[PDB]
PDB file of C-alpha atoms and ligand atoms in Angstrom:
ATOM      1  CA  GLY A   1     -14.000  20.090  13.043  1.00  0.00           C
ATOM      2  CA  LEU A   2     -12.821  17.211  10.823  1.00  0.00           C
ATOM      3  CA  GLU A   3     -13.511  14.765  13.638  1.00  0.00           C
ATOM      4  CA  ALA A   4     -17.217  15.272  12.847  1.00  0.00           C
ATOM      5  CA  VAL A   5     -16.550  14.411   9.190  1.00  0.00           C
ATOM      6  CA  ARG A   6     -15.009  11.050  10.158  1.00  0.00           C
ATOM      7  CA  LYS A   7     -18.004  10.219  12.368  1.00  0.00           C
ATOM      8  CA  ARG A   8     -20.727  11.437   9.986  1.00  0.00           C
ATOM      9  CA  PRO A   9     -19.153  10.995   6.510  1.00  0.00           C
ATOM     10  CA  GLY A  10     -22.619  10.499   4.945  1.00  0.00           C
ATOM     11  CA  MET A  11     -23.412  14.163   5.688  1.00  0.00           C
ATOM     12  CA  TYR A  12     -20.333  15.355   3.781  1.00  0.00           C
ATOM     13  CA  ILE A  13     -19.951  12.969   0.825  1.00  0.00           C
ATOM     14  CA  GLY A  14     -23.449  11.650   0.408  1.00  0.00           C
ATOM     15  CA  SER A  15     -22.568   8.001   0.694  1.00  0.00           C
ATOM     16  CA  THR A  16     -19.807   5.833   2.029  1.00  0.00           C
ATOM     17  CA  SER A  17     -20.375   3.288  -0.730  1.00  0.00           C
ATOM     18  CA  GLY A  18     -18.510   3.209  -4.072  1.00  0.00           C
ATOM     19  CA  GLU A  19     -20.278   6.474  -4.965  1.00  0.00           C
ATOM     20  CA  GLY A  20     -18.613   8.277  -2.043  1.00  0.00           C
ATOM     21  CA  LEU A  21     -15.260   6.678  -2.857  1.00  0.00           C
ATOM     22  CA  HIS A  22     -15.366   8.253  -6.327  1.00  0.00           C
ATOM     23  CA  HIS A  23     -16.708  11.520  -4.970  1.00  0.00           C
ATOM     24  CA  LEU A  24     -13.375  12.036  -3.169  1.00  0.00           C
ATOM     25  CA  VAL A  25     -11.647  12.197  -6.550  1.00  0.00           C
ATOM     26  CA  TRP A  26     -14.014  14.921  -7.808  1.00  0.00           C
ATOM     27  CA  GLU A  27     -13.554  17.012  -4.682  1.00  0.00           C
ATOM     28  CA  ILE A  28      -9.797  17.148  -5.328  1.00  0.00           C
ATOM     29  CA  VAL A  29     -10.093  17.510  -9.132  1.00  0.00           C
ATOM     30  CA  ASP A  30     -12.529  20.446  -8.653  1.00  0.00           C
ATOM     31  CA  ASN A  31      -9.719  22.404  -7.018  1.00  0.00           C
ATOM     32  CA  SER A  32      -7.475  21.841 -10.065  1.00  0.00           C
ATOM     33  CA  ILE A  33     -10.421  22.851 -12.288  1.00  0.00           C
ATOM     34  CA  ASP A  34     -10.722  26.119 -10.340  1.00  0.00           C
ATOM     35  CA  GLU A  35      -7.028  26.822 -10.980  1.00  0.00           C
ATOM     36  CA  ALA A  36      -7.626  26.191 -14.699  1.00  0.00           C
ATOM     37  CA  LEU A  37     -10.534  28.685 -14.573  1.00  0.00           C
ATOM     38  CA  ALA A  38      -8.188  31.176 -12.900  1.00  0.00           C
ATOM     39  CA  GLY A  39      -6.137  30.748 -16.102  1.00  0.00           C
ATOM     40  CA  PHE A  40      -3.003  29.091 -14.732  1.00  0.00           C
ATOM     41  CA  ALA A  41      -3.509  25.305 -14.786  1.00  0.00           C
ATOM     42  CA  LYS A  42      -3.406  23.823 -18.308  1.00  0.00           C
ATOM     43  CA  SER A  43      -3.166  20.113 -17.595  1.00  0.00           C
ATOM     44  CA  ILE A  44      -4.545  17.787 -14.929  1.00  0.00           C
ATOM     45  CA  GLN A  45      -3.510  14.159 -14.368  1.00  0.00           C
ATOM     46  CA  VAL A  46      -5.604  11.742 -12.324  1.00  0.00           C
ATOM     47  CA  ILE A  47      -3.856   8.479 -11.424  1.00  0.00           C
ATOM     48  CA  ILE A  48      -5.234   5.326  -9.807  1.00  0.00           C
ATOM     49  CA  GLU A  49      -2.138   4.003  -8.064  1.00  0.00           C
ATOM     50  CA  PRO A  50      -1.465   0.250  -7.746  1.00  0.00           C
ATOM     51  CA  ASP A  51      -2.868   0.227  -4.191  1.00  0.00           C
ATOM     52  CA  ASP A  52      -6.176   1.986  -5.134  1.00  0.00           C
ATOM     53  CA  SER A  53      -4.848   5.304  -3.844  1.00  0.00           C
ATOM     54  CA  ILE A  54      -5.325   8.441  -5.981  1.00  0.00           C
ATOM     55  CA  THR A  55      -2.865  11.044  -7.250  1.00  0.00           C
ATOM     56  CA  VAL A  56      -4.062  14.334  -8.785  1.00  0.00           C
ATOM     57  CA  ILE A  57      -1.451  16.567 -10.458  1.00  0.00           C
ATOM     58  CA  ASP A  58      -1.982  20.055 -11.865  1.00  0.00           C
ATOM     59  CA  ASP A  59       0.406  22.571 -13.327  1.00  0.00           C
ATOM     60  CA  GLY A  60      -1.077  25.698 -11.834  1.00  0.00           C
ATOM     61  CA  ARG A  61       0.509  28.269  -9.556  1.00  0.00           C
ATOM     62  CA  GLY A  62       0.558  26.013  -6.531  1.00  0.00           C
ATOM     63  CA  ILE A  63      -1.491  26.391  -3.341  1.00  0.00           C
ATOM     64  CA  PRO A  64      -0.377  29.525  -1.440  1.00  0.00           C
ATOM     65  CA  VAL A  65       2.213  28.566   1.192  1.00  0.00           C
ATOM     66  CA  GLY A  66       2.317  31.786   3.254  1.00  0.00           C
ATOM     67  CA  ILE A  67       1.288  32.249   6.774  1.00  0.00           C
ATOM     68  CA  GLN A  68      -2.230  33.695   7.094  1.00  0.00           C
ATOM     69  CA  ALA A  69      -2.675  36.362   9.790  1.00  0.00           C
ATOM     70  CA  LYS A  70      -6.051  34.943  10.841  1.00  0.00           C
ATOM     71  CA  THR A  71      -4.817  31.404  11.451  1.00  0.00           C
ATOM     72  CA  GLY A  72      -1.059  31.722  12.063  1.00  0.00           C
ATOM     73  CA  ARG A  73      -0.642  28.673   9.797  1.00  0.00           C
ATOM     74  CA  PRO A  74       0.399  28.273   6.112  1.00  0.00           C
ATOM     75  CA  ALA A  75      -2.571  28.654   3.725  1.00  0.00           C
ATOM     76  CA  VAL A  76      -1.945  25.152   2.316  1.00  0.00           C
ATOM     77  CA  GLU A  77      -2.291  23.554   5.782  1.00  0.00           C
ATOM     78  CA  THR A  78      -5.649  25.323   6.283  1.00  0.00           C
ATOM     79  CA  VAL A  79      -6.861  23.964   2.900  1.00  0.00           C
ATOM     80  CA  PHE A  80      -6.657  20.424   4.269  1.00  0.00           C
ATOM     81  CA  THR A  81      -7.312  20.839   7.996  1.00  0.00           C
ATOM     82  CA  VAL A  82     -10.212  23.304   8.296  1.00  0.00           C
ATOM     83  CA  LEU A  83     -13.808  22.399   7.378  1.00  0.00           C
ATOM     84  CA  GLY A 104     -14.063  19.753  -0.014  1.00  0.00           C
ATOM     85  CA  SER A 105     -10.304  19.179   0.218  1.00  0.00           C
ATOM     86  CA  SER A 106     -10.429  18.915   4.039  1.00  0.00           C
ATOM     87  CA  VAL A 107     -13.256  16.349   3.794  1.00  0.00           C
ATOM     88  CA  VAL A 108     -11.058  14.188   1.521  1.00  0.00           C
ATOM     89  CA  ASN A 109      -8.237  14.538   4.030  1.00  0.00           C
ATOM     90  CA  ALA A 110     -10.483  13.503   6.937  1.00  0.00           C
ATOM     91  CA  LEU A 111     -11.698  10.364   5.119  1.00  0.00           C
ATOM     92  CA  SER A 112      -8.230   9.209   4.059  1.00  0.00           C
ATOM     93  CA  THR A 113      -5.731   7.066   5.969  1.00  0.00           C
ATOM     94  CA  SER A 114      -3.137   9.474   4.582  1.00  0.00           C
ATOM     95  CA  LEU A 115      -3.059  12.508   2.334  1.00  0.00           C
ATOM     96  CA  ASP A 116       0.125  14.159   1.112  1.00  0.00           C
ATOM     97  CA  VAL A 117       0.399  17.487  -0.691  1.00  0.00           C
ATOM     98  CA  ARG A 118       3.346  18.780  -2.704  1.00  0.00           C
ATOM     99  CA  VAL A 119       3.326  22.406  -3.842  1.00  0.00           C
ATOM    100  CA  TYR A 120       5.805  23.370  -6.584  1.00  0.00           C
ATOM    101  CA  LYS A 121       6.305  27.130  -6.282  1.00  0.00           C
ATOM    102  CA  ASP A 122       9.181  29.646  -6.556  1.00  0.00           C
ATOM    103  CA  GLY A 123      11.776  26.942  -7.259  1.00  0.00           C
ATOM    104  CA  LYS A 124      10.840  24.956  -4.135  1.00  0.00           C
ATOM    105  CA  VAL A 125       8.775  21.846  -3.311  1.00  0.00           C
ATOM    106  CA  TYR A 126       6.704  22.399  -0.161  1.00  0.00           C
ATOM    107  CA  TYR A 127       5.436  19.211   1.465  1.00  0.00           C
ATOM    108  CA  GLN A 128       2.915  18.306   4.157  1.00  0.00           C
ATOM    109  CA  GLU A 129       1.175  15.074   5.109  1.00  0.00           C
ATOM    110  CA  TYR A 130      -1.821  14.185   7.285  1.00  0.00           C
ATOM    111  CA  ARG A 131      -2.964  10.865   8.771  1.00  0.00           C
ATOM    112  CA  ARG A 132      -6.699  10.292   9.186  1.00  0.00           C
ATOM    113  CA  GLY A 133      -6.917  14.091   8.917  1.00  0.00           C
ATOM    114  CA  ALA A 134      -4.286  14.933  11.558  1.00  0.00           C
ATOM    115  CA  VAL A 135      -1.147  16.923  10.662  1.00  0.00           C
ATOM    116  CA  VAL A 136       2.129  14.932  10.703  1.00  0.00           C
ATOM    117  CA  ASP A 137       4.548  17.865  10.653  1.00  0.00           C
ATOM    118  CA  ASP A 138       4.778  21.553   9.755  1.00  0.00           C
ATOM    119  CA  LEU A 139       5.036  22.381   6.042  1.00  0.00           C
ATOM    120  CA  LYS A 140       8.608  21.776   4.872  1.00  0.00           C
ATOM    121  CA  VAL A 141      10.707  22.520   1.800  1.00  0.00           C
ATOM    122  CA  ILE A 142      11.918  19.065   0.700  1.00  0.00           C
ATOM    123  CA  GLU A 143      13.360  19.645  -2.805  1.00  0.00           C
ATOM    124  CA  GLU A 144      14.165  22.271  -5.410  1.00  0.00           C
ATOM    125  CA  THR A 145      12.116  22.360  -8.609  1.00  0.00           C
ATOM    126  CA  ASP A 146      11.707  24.188 -11.908  1.00  0.00           C
ATOM    127  CA  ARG A 147       8.023  23.367 -12.282  1.00  0.00           C
ATOM    128  CA  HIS A 148       4.862  24.846 -10.763  1.00  0.00           C
ATOM    129  CA  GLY A 149       1.613  23.312  -9.596  1.00  0.00           C
ATOM    130  CA  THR A 150      -0.015  21.185  -6.905  1.00  0.00           C
ATOM    131  CA  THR A 151       0.069  17.409  -6.429  1.00  0.00           C
ATOM    132  CA  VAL A 152      -2.301  15.731  -3.963  1.00  0.00           C
ATOM    133  CA  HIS A 153      -2.191  12.021  -3.196  1.00  0.00           C
ATOM    134  CA  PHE A 154      -4.637  10.284  -0.881  1.00  0.00           C
ATOM    135  CA  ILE A 155      -5.447   6.800   0.387  1.00  0.00           C
ATOM    136  CA  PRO A 156      -9.192   6.402   1.134  1.00  0.00           C
ATOM    137  CA  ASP A 157      -9.809   5.013   4.636  1.00  0.00           C
ATOM    138  CA  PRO A 158     -11.390   1.516   4.685  1.00  0.00           C
ATOM    139  CA  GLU A 159     -12.727   2.388   8.182  1.00  0.00           C
ATOM    140  CA  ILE A 160     -14.974   4.826   6.308  1.00  0.00           C
ATOM    141  CA  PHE A 161     -15.350   3.011   2.969  1.00  0.00           C
ATOM    142  CA  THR A 162     -16.341  -0.360   4.382  1.00  0.00           C
ATOM    143  CA  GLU A 163     -18.183  -1.639   1.282  1.00  0.00           C
ATOM    144  CA  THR A 164     -15.372  -1.035  -1.239  1.00  0.00           C
ATOM    145  CA  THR A 165     -12.070   0.843  -1.637  1.00  0.00           C
ATOM    146  CA  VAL A 166     -11.680  -0.323  -5.260  1.00  0.00           C
ATOM    147  CA  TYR A 167     -11.814   2.338  -8.020  1.00  0.00           C
ATOM    148  CA  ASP A 168     -13.690   2.015 -11.309  1.00  0.00           C
ATOM    149  CA  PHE A 169     -11.478   3.234 -14.161  1.00  0.00           C
ATOM    150  CA  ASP A 170     -14.332   3.468 -16.686  1.00  0.00           C
ATOM    151  CA  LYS A 171     -16.456   5.477 -14.194  1.00  0.00           C
ATOM    152  CA  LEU A 172     -13.553   7.894 -13.634  1.00  0.00           C
ATOM    153  CA  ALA A 173     -12.719   8.083 -17.371  1.00  0.00           C
ATOM    154  CA  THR A 174     -16.333   8.863 -18.305  1.00  0.00           C
ATOM    155  CA  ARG A 175     -16.462  11.863 -15.959  1.00  0.00           C
ATOM    156  CA  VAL A 176     -12.935  13.008 -16.875  1.00  0.00           C
ATOM    157  CA  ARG A 177     -14.063  13.123 -20.525  1.00  0.00           C
ATOM    158  CA  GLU A 178     -17.154  15.141 -19.542  1.00  0.00           C
ATOM    159  CA  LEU A 179     -14.934  17.485 -17.513  1.00  0.00           C
ATOM    160  CA  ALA A 180     -12.598  17.987 -20.498  1.00  0.00           C
ATOM    161  CA  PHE A 181     -15.631  18.924 -22.624  1.00  0.00           C
ATOM    162  CA  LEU A 182     -17.108  21.319 -20.045  1.00  0.00           C
ATOM    163  CA  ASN A 183     -13.657  22.860 -19.537  1.00  0.00           C
ATOM    164  CA  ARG A 184     -12.817  23.183 -23.240  1.00  0.00           C
ATOM    165  CA  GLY A 185      -9.076  23.822 -23.688  1.00  0.00           C
ATOM    166  CA  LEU A 186      -8.042  21.835 -20.609  1.00  0.00           C
ATOM    167  CA  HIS A 187      -5.834  18.768 -20.950  1.00  0.00           C
ATOM    168  CA  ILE A 188      -7.000  16.114 -18.534  1.00  0.00           C
ATOM    169  CA  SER A 189      -5.969  12.474 -18.331  1.00  0.00           C
ATOM    170  CA  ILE A 190      -6.890   9.402 -16.318  1.00  0.00           C
ATOM    171  CA  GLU A 191      -4.438   6.563 -15.714  1.00  0.00           C
ATOM    172  CA  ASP A 192      -4.789   3.145 -14.100  1.00  0.00           C
ATOM    173  CA  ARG A 193      -1.561   1.661 -12.681  1.00  0.00           C
ATOM    174  CA  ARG A 194      -3.171  -1.415 -11.129  1.00  0.00           C
ATOM    175  CA  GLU A 195      -1.825  -4.911 -11.836  1.00  0.00           C
ATOM    176  CA  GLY A 196      -2.887  -6.523 -15.140  1.00  0.00           C
ATOM    177  CA  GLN A 197      -5.065  -3.610 -16.244  1.00  0.00           C
ATOM    178  CA  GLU A 198      -2.768  -0.641 -16.847  1.00  0.00           C
ATOM    179  CA  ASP A 199      -4.503   1.908 -19.081  1.00  0.00           C
ATOM    180  CA  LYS A 200      -4.490   5.635 -19.806  1.00  0.00           C
ATOM    181  CA  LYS A 201      -6.875   7.942 -21.641  1.00  0.00           C
ATOM    182  CA  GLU A 202      -6.039  11.566 -22.442  1.00  0.00           C
ATOM    183  CA  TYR A 203      -8.654  14.193 -23.291  1.00  0.00           C
ATOM    184  CA  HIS A 204      -8.456  17.671 -24.790  1.00  0.00           C
ATOM    185  CA  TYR A 205     -11.138  19.618 -26.590  1.00  0.00           C
ATOM    186  CA  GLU A 206      -9.618  22.400 -28.676  1.00  0.00           C
ATOM    187  CA  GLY A 207     -10.380  26.110 -28.305  1.00  0.00           C
ATOM    188  CA  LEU A 208     -10.234  28.728 -31.085  1.00  0.00           C
ATOM    189  CA  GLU A 209      -7.120  27.064 -32.585  1.00  0.00           C
ATOM    190  CA  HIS A 210      -9.368  24.270 -33.941  1.00  0.00           C
TER     191      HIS A 210
HETATM  192  C1  920 B   1      -4.312  18.601  -7.094  1.00  0.00           C
HETATM  193  N1  920 B   1      -4.526  20.037  -7.050  1.00  0.00           N
HETATM  194  C2  920 B   1      -5.094  20.662  -5.988  1.00  0.00           C
HETATM  195  C3  920 B   1      -5.767  20.047  -4.924  1.00  0.00           C
HETATM  196  C4  920 B   1      -6.312  20.799  -3.865  1.00  0.00           C
HETATM  197  F1  920 B   1      -6.913  20.124  -2.862  1.00  0.00           F
HETATM  198  C5  920 B   1      -6.230  22.209  -3.806  1.00  0.00           C
HETATM  199  C6  920 B   1      -5.575  22.877  -4.843  1.00  0.00           C
HETATM  200  C7  920 B   1      -4.992  22.123  -5.962  1.00  0.00           C
HETATM  201  N2  920 B   1      -4.431  22.983  -6.837  1.00  0.00           N
HETATM  202  C8  920 B   1      -4.538  24.255  -6.435  1.00  0.00           C
HETATM  203  N3  920 B   1      -4.112  25.388  -7.004  1.00  0.00           N
HETATM  204  C9  920 B   1      -4.328  26.563  -6.400  1.00  0.00           C
HETATM  205  O1  920 B   1      -3.826  27.648  -7.047  1.00  0.00           O
HETATM  206  C10 920 B   1      -3.852  28.898  -6.499  1.00  0.00           C
HETATM  207  C11 920 B   1      -2.670  29.610  -6.321  1.00  0.00           C
HETATM  208  N4  920 B   1      -2.747  30.854  -5.806  1.00  0.00           N
HETATM  209  C12 920 B   1      -3.945  31.390  -5.465  1.00  0.00           C
HETATM  210  C13 920 B   1      -4.017  32.781  -4.885  1.00  0.00           C
HETATM  211  N5  920 B   1      -5.095  30.705  -5.637  1.00  0.00           N
HETATM  212  C14 920 B   1      -5.068  29.471  -6.152  1.00  0.00           C
HETATM  213  N6  920 B   1      -5.006  26.684  -5.231  1.00  0.00           N
HETATM  214  C15 920 B   1      -5.495  25.627  -4.535  1.00  0.00           C
HETATM  215  N7  920 B   1      -6.225  25.928  -3.389  1.00  0.00           N
HETATM  216  C16 920 B   1      -7.326  25.107  -2.896  1.00  0.00           C
HETATM  217  C17 920 B   1      -8.319  26.189  -2.441  1.00  0.00           C
HETATM  218  C18 920 B   1      -9.364  26.702  -3.438  1.00  0.00           C
HETATM  219  N8  920 B   1      -9.642  25.908  -4.628  1.00  0.00           N
HETATM  220  C19 920 B   1      -8.494  27.932  -3.686  1.00  0.00           C
HETATM  221  C20 920 B   1      -7.596  27.522  -2.513  1.00  0.00           C
HETATM  222  C21 920 B   1      -7.814  28.393  -1.272  1.00  0.00           C
HETATM  223  C22 920 B   1      -6.123  27.239  -2.765  1.00  0.00           C
HETATM  224  C23 920 B   1      -5.281  24.288  -5.162  1.00  0.00           C
END
């Protein structure tokens, strides 16, 4: 399972250098992209947190939270624990997911890929979507755990263009360099 990912990360993310570090972002963002293609997500936020962790927020339907017959576990748990999203989980010190669905916020967290506790309703909400936050593991990313805002922004812009109509932003919250760029290419309303 994911134990193999932690021992051979090069086979799953291509490189454990800075390139692999950034690849984790795209693996998560690609899920939000898929939910935009499904027609439900309209906006995606990518945030570099002050500690070089990453938050990705979409306003889609939210990852399914029901128990799957095949696994006996909530669908959202399987997304992160069974071998892109599960690879990011495995290579992070911690990953937390919040699903905003049916007036509830469903929460689960993992540590170096391992489940902390069963999925739990933690809050009520009026919004919908999925928020994933992860802290890349320096035991894996031994060269660098520092994100490149311009590198992320460049690809986010490309992604906005390829997914015309999508709102996507990138934000840096790190000390002395706070920045944000927002992208949106218009559809037929142009
Ligand atoms: C930061 N965002 C983020 C991050 C993330 F890691 C996953 C999702 C994610 N956002 C997501 N939104 C949905 O939306 C749905 C809702 N309902 C259904 C039936 N399918 C997709 N599904 C999601 N998933 C992930 C798996 C495939 N892309 C389809 C899934 C089996 C379910 C995500």
